[PDB]
């Protein structure tokens, strides 16, 4: 199962790891993607997860959008996990670089509560522009299920652990 994680709370764990490498190793039931409303997996975590699936995640996502239309900011959908996981939970955190409301970050993390255990990135962090320290705080105060957070950047991982209240 999950190894090498630091326990932050009763249900939140954290590790300095590449979420693609972590997914290929653990083969979790659920891997969370840092999705946008269009499921266009171009960059950041989404671009990396999609590249690992040889673009199969993008082909499946385009069919999902053609049928259902875009997701809401704060919303999610469950699609295949391809070669990375049983399922991928595509969760849309607000992208503050696109002017999306940061208050929707709690709604985005609420989607994790529908799954007993997840491998996930910090929502709205990285290219989504939010403060990752704030994202971790919203995560621990919102998610009640078991979440294993993979933080790619070592320097950010160290800052997140050393500043965790």
Ligand X SMILES: CC(C)NCc1ccc(N(C)C)cc1
What residue ranges bind ligand X (CB under 6 A)? 27, 29, 81, 83-86
Minimal distance, residue 66 CB to ligand X, in Å: 25
Q: Judged by CB, which is closer to ligand X: 118, or 149?
A: 118
Interatomic CA distance for residues 157 and 7, integer angstroms: 13
Residue nearest to ligand X (CB): 27
Q: Judged by CB, which is closer to ligand X: 37, or 119?
A: 119
Q: Judged by CB, which is closer to ligand X: 21, or 158?
A: 21
Q: Are 87 and 2 within 8 A, CB to CB?
A: no
Interatomic CA distance for residues 100 and 96, integer angstroms: 5
Distance of CA 33 to the CA centre of its chain: 4
Minimal distance, residue 101 CB to ligand X, in Å: 34
Q: Are 31 and 18 within 8 A, CB to CB?
A: no
Residue 66: both structure tokens together: 């053609």
Minimal distance, residue 29 CB to ligand X, in Å: 5
């Amino acid at each position: 199962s999950f190894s090498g994680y630091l326990k932050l709370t009763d249900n939140v764990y954290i590790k300095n790891a590449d979420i693609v490498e972590e997914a290929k190793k653990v083969k979790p039931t659920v891997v969370v993607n840092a999705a946008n409303v269009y499921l266009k997996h171009g960059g950041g975590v989404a671009g990396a997860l999609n590249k690992a699936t040889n673009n199969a995640m993008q082909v499946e996502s385009d069919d999902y959008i053609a049928t259902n239309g875009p997701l809401k900011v704060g919303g999610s959908c469950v699609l295949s996990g391809h070669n990375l996981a049983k399922h991928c939970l595509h969760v849309v955190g607000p992208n503050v670089n696109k002017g999306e409301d940061i208050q929707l970050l709690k709604s985005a993390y609420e989607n994790f509560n529908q799954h007993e255990v997840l491998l996930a990135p910090l929502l709205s962090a990285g290219i989504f522009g939010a403060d990752p320290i704030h994202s971790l705080r919203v995560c621990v105060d919102t998610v009640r299920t078991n979440v294993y957070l993979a933080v790619f950047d070592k320097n950010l991982y160290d800052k997140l652990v050393s500043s965790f209240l």
